[PDB]
């Protein structure tokens, strides 16, 4: 049978911490009451309606002397070309050989898993009579995150700082993907240039299969200048001297 | 026949037969070479002409009163014109 | 369209406290690339294979002088009776007029709800061309 | 005849001020001594060497039993297939019907002309017997300029300023494409943000055919922060208060 592909939307926190989620899927299963045979041997009859074709040709007049032949799925066998009396299949499928069942799959998203990574559930796809079921393949879709951008195992963020912080040193705090508060300290007497990047080592994403190893966090600094007229002209001399 | 049956597919396995007036004889069922009729009608046996009728409305005429111009309607081959 | 019925298994604690749960369902949606038309007007062709029937009659010999005629869904149009070139529909449906999409429904189970109670999501069932979706 | 295309490399100053330049080109002209006839009527003889083919097949042995046939241009008629005795053409062409002459073209580059603009000299290409000459087409190629980048009729430049200049106002001078010194003044109490753009109106490129109208000059400001440790920590408080 055909494999079923489903996108699983995951956050950066889900990918960092790991996540177990329950996915509800509706799939075709072989009808438990007739084991797909549709019905008993000799219960399966040619649909009289479409004469086994699955489809009926309906004639719609558009104008006198203009008829449109439309092919419609046959109402009496729903396209199957066969009819099975309810008593021979069950009061479930309806000569269809399958029933829609709701299955809950438990999905494990491991630490450090990547965008586009596949989680396969073997033989979990749609069942059909005389067909071995395909797989359900979940495709991991990473959601955009407001603070962090992921590059492989590394994380990138933009942090806004004032001119005073950029020149005189600073301390700031942010929330990481595990919910820890990280305190970043930059010593006085070192300058942060506008757009410059600094690194916080080991505060990136965990490696897949090796969650003890992590990438790095790169912080791009956006240096905010003070507004128009922030200082009296008389004090510009004192600033120049410094 | 004057008409052609054109088949329009609506979907694979749904065909609509539409009757269209035949492009080649404009519904007449016959064709006359231009040289045999003229460069006017076109095997049509008639031409559209613009006629000016002078209409006299007499004093005291009533709403719904009829003014008839005899034989002034459309001409057709082998047909005496209406009014 | 037909309504889709799904059993939602709930515990007594879920029914007592109330519960919000996310249900992932796969449904047929109209193909965004051809708006169900399947393809452009005149892109829809009769399947040559089954001559518009959706099905092919395959002859299986059981023994010399015993042939079984089996009706199989036509491989070339997957039962539709029509074929649409990929370029006329998209590289998605495949002349099918629909695509399987995964939708997440947020389901609210209120306090005191009963066994057999129905929660309806209107128009959320399978879409088909020229058919208003069921619930 | 075929048109001759020549790239003319022009600077922004050339395009702003206008430029007259002399271009020396070598072209084929009809031989003044035989008027292309090659020679007198009956002076033109089939080349005996190549029997009128212009080419000779030379056999080079590569190994015994391996011969390479190479087609070479015929030495005796230089590919023409004909030979004209020197006395019948002149001591110039040599039965060639043309001579290489050096022509100087005066090229006018007007104010506001654009990259890729064509200057055509009609009938100035190579002459051949019984062929009307093609044109010489000069294609203007704008050279990169160290300070200014041109966009249509507008000019762009990057100007570096200190943090003090960005906050307290500044005055600077630059040399324009006409060689004028432009003094740009920015008033005190207005801030220049890093990477912000300002405009000096009417200091762009002149419009082609309308050199009284000019585009604008856009100045991107690159704000230079002071280096690491530029101020004593004790003075950081005084800076914060301002
Ligand atoms: Zn069944
Ligand atoms: Zn049927
Ligand atoms: Zn489609
Ligand atoms: Zn088919
Ligand atoms: Zn000569
Ligand atoms: Zn020769």
Numbering used by the authors:
A (entry chain C), D (entry chain G): 43 to 284
B (entry chain P): 95 to 177
C (entry chain B): 43 to 177
Published text:
J-domain proteins tune the specificity of Hsp70s, engaging them in precise functions. Common to all of them is the presence of the J-domain (JD), an α-helical hairpin structure of 70–75 residues found at the N-terminus of A and B classes and anywhere in class C. In class A JDPs, the JD is followed by a flexible glycine/phenylalanine-rich region (G/FR), two homologous β sandwich domains (CTD I and II), with a Zn-finger-like region (ZFLR) inserted into the first one, a dimerization domain (DD), and a C-terminal domain (CD)8. DNAJA2 has a potent holding activity, collaborates with Hsp70 in substrate remodelling and has been associated with other functions. We explore human DNAJA2, finding that it reversibly forms highly-ordered, tubular structures that can be dissociated by Hsc70, the constitutively expressed Hsp70 isoform.
We directed our attention to the DNAJA2ΔG/FR mutant because a preliminary inspection of these oligomers suggested them to be less flexible, possibly due to a lack of the disordered G/FR. A preliminary 3D reconstruction without imposing symmetry yielded 9.2 Å resolution and revealed the same general features observed for DNAJA2wt: an oligomeric structure in which the dimers associate in longitudinal filaments interacting laterally (~100 Å separation) to form a helical arrangement with ~32 Å pitch. The helical structure could also be visualised as disks of five DNAJA2ΔG/FR dimers, separated by ~76 Å. We finally imposed D5 symmetry in the longitudinal axis, which generated a better 3D reconstruction of 6.9 Å resolution. A clear picture emerged again of the arrangement of dimeric DNAJA2 within the oligomer: the DD is placed in the outer part of the structure, followed by the main body of the monomer (the CTDI, containing the ZFLR, and the CTDII), and at the core of the helical tube, with a very flexible arrangement, the JD. Docking was excellent with regard to the DD, CTDI and CTDII domains, whereas some movements were required to fit the ZFLR into the central cylinder of the tubular structure. Docking analysis revealed that, as expected from the disordered nature of its amino acid sequence, the CD located downstream from the DD is not visible. Despite the clear role of JD in DNAJA2 oligomerisation, no mass in the 3D reconstruction could be attributed to this domain. The linker (13 residues) that connects the JD to the main body of the cochaperone in DNAJA2ΔG/FR is flexible enough to average out the JD during the 3D reconstruction process. The first seems to be related to the longitudinal interaction of DNAJA2 dimers that could lead to filament formation. It is located in the core region of the CTDI implicated in substrate interaction, and involves residues L135Q136 of monomers in adjacent dimers within the same filament (red circles in Fig. 4b).
